[PDB]
Amino acid sequence: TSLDGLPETQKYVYADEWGFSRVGADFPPGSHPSLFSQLLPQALFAFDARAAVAAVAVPLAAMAAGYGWLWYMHSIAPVWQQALCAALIGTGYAGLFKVAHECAMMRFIPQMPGLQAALGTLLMAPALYSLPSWRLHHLHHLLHTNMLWQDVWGWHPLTKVELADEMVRSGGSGGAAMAAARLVLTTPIKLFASVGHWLRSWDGLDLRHFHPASYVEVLSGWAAPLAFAGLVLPAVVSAGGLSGFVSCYLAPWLVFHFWLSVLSLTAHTAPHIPWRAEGDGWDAGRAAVAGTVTLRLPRPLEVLLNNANYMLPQAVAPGLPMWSAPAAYAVLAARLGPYLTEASMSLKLLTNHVTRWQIYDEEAHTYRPMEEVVDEIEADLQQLAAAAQQ
Amino acid sequence: XXXXYXXXXXXXXXXXXXXXXXXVHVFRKXXXXXXX
Amino acid sequence: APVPVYTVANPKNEFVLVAGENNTQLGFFFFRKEDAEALIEKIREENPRLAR
């Protein structure tokens, strides 16, 4: 961790300065997250049908309510009513997508594996996502959490060195890639950068990345999104025209991607969480316990998202079901207390994420704003040009 | 029956009290209903 | 038969009535479509559901 041994005063002033509640101390090296699976009571792993049907039915009810309203008042309503129904539908679908993510890791209904596979496929299709590819990318993420140059399926930060290289190649700060980075990680559109993730799935639609023994399974995975976008996105358009498309599909889609992106970005990024390269001090347990941030929401939001913010517990006990994630956290907070980091979703946090922590420099091993960093490295460009005198 | 008319705006009269102000204004002496 | 009239209705083939006082309801038949058009564009300004 970045803030090593130091009294509670500087910890807490950093905490309320950045919007976190409890910052974290320092974890010993040489460990593994799967260790602390022994700190969990065995009753947490039990299956019950009540929570299952509740988790699959609450977000469905929210979605149905939003749609019934929106169709009852199709296009006679002003823009704010449309925005509110879109937000409701997007959140309901984020809940159903958390259920599908559970079925992808094989921990929702293990007794009926065919049924849980079919359910995950069905719930993932409307977001145009593939279930087998999702499983693969998530496993690869769990194996490489916070590893520099390797965690490509997470919010890999834009480092100073690659930026300097691109600026030396561009011959100035006016190129195309320059302005692209400029607007993507300086404006609120960052809270939607998850859409980039969506495009990096479909690994070129290239069966040459996978193991041959799995071709038929991967192909099938790609055919459920396509079939949707080939049989249902026509109907919608044909039955509502452009407007009946932008209000019935595109706005809930953008809301869902907001949820996905903000959840992940807040989860694994903070000024006191370093990104060590491989061989240079990367530790697995240290990165999965100390390098994680838990977001706290109002309980209505939580029960709508199926506890989608609680990510730390299911990284130490990958078989821990979804409805036991809150309780389990309370257990770990007792024993791993001094090391965890926590935050509450507020405006200050997102403003800091957008305006302050933009570039990651490894020498200082911290995040710094894009503009001051680029003008500093450009002044050093001028000074090496002066050093290039002869 | 019929409805008396007077092209003053063209006022009218029925056996409510229309006034097809040239637009429309179906006065009373509020079109929320549907036949069955 | 050779001379028609125009009326405004629901999609479900039901007349739209203008009920006034004492639940007395008046229908209409217009010898020009501009009149039904005026009636519907007046309906829209006080109820967008029926007019839609």
Ligand SMILES: CC(C)CCC[C@@H](C)[C@H]1CC[C@H]2[C@@H]3CC=C4C[C@@H](OC(=O)CCC(=O)O)CC[C@]4(C)[C@H]3CC[C@]12C
């Ligand atoms: C059109 C709407 C209404 C329905 C949704 C369509 C999607 C299913 C399409 C449109 C965008 C497509 C993607 C656009 C970009 C690419 C990259 C492309 O591959 C490459 O560019 C390879 C690398 C290279 O060319 O250098 C093909 C796959 C993929 C992910 C495409 C997969 C299919 C996608 C997601």
